[PDB]
């Protein structure tokens with residue numbers, strides 16, 4: 001397949017810099033134009049810069065001047081994006097794109113490289129169970145939950161009963177509160193079989209190599 | 218700097234319904250340089266329509282594009298579930314190249330009242346000196362909803378964190394989670410904790426609370 005392969009996810013402290021890469025297979029980048037596009041968390045698309053690898057000529061959106069540097073290496077068939085003096089405003093998914101390299105087909109976009117700029121330290125989440133308090137008068141089904149709080153960085157993996165419970169589950173997008181993330185997950189199961197058949201919330205935080213099993217009681 | 222404005226920002230369509238969205242440019246652009254991309258959560262934008270009216274590889278015949286100068290549109294003859302996504306128009310006419318703000322297309326379904334559940338802090342959390350009260354408002358439609366936190370007759374604004382899920386792939390509903398966090402002390406200081414949800418499916422609010 002023709003495709004653009006980008007380097008892995010980046011987690012960088014503010015004030016630092018980072019160089020992202022994008023390698024083409026199936027065509028030579030010197031035969032087209034390479035671009036980098038930024039998409040801020042939950043936002044639209046912003047063109048950053050363009051480069052013609054055959055001569056190195058570049059174009060930049062004025063607002064990234066002094067921040068972004070695009071370069072390319074035709075021998076490795078790779079385009080690069082350098083970002084300096086990183087700030088939280090730089091946190092975003094960065095895509096490299098190539099104008100259509102062949103007639104009859106469209107353009108190509110890499111899978112994206114997530115860049116997170118934060119000074120926060122790696123922190124494992126505090127996993128708290130959410131069990132019904134009041135007498136609970138919800139006849140056929142019951143909703144339980146889990147609160148995954150104060151962790152960094154993303155992501156955390158949440159499953160119920162080790163992946164066996166997958167229907168009626170709602171794992172909400174994490175929210176940032178003071179450099180640290182917090183998320184919650186709810187699961188609804190027949191009340192006839194709870195708490196007889198235990199419901200456990202399994203939270204995994206890769207970055208801190210933690211895995212907690214909080215049983216709802 | 219050729220600004221692209223998309224209308225509407227968000228829009229719902231029942232299955233089978235005809236859909237039209239527009240893209241307007243601050244300055245005229247060649248129709249050969251105006252494109253549309255489709256994006257779904259978690260994946261890269263994908264070329265949908267190139268040069269105003271041509272469908273990209275694999276794009277369904279139900280889609281179409283029209284326009285020139287400063288006015289363009291994308292139309293879907295008949296709405297299908299997998300059409301739900303964000304569509305961005307893009308001008309590759311003059312630098313800086315720009316994208317419109319996007320049109321998020323959602324699926325219209327029958328209204329549905331939220332299933333509300335309130336949860337008290339955990340003893341584990343209380344032992345660490347914190348107290349988060351959580352409220353889930355699940356599977357409702359439409360997405361518009363307001364949640365109020367009340368502690369002992371006082372609306373609590375600060376310290377609330379809300380999170381919404383993407384439209385459900387199975388039932389086209391939305392879900393919300395709201396969390397009110399206080400210190401362990403503030404929490405033991407009050408006894409009535411209420412989560413109030415106002416949704417168009419009902420005049421009176423849905424109320425869920427607990428004591429102590």
Ligand SMILES: O=C(O)CCCC(=O)Nc1ccc(CC[N+]2([O-])CCCCC2)cc1
Nearest residue numbers: 035097098099104105106107267273274309
């Ligand atoms: O699909 C076909 O059958 C014919 C392909 C024609 C075609 O897709 N042309 C086309 C499509 C998209 C673009 C935009 C390319 N671009 O690299 C996208 C990222 C931002 C900068 C510009 C430019 C030209």
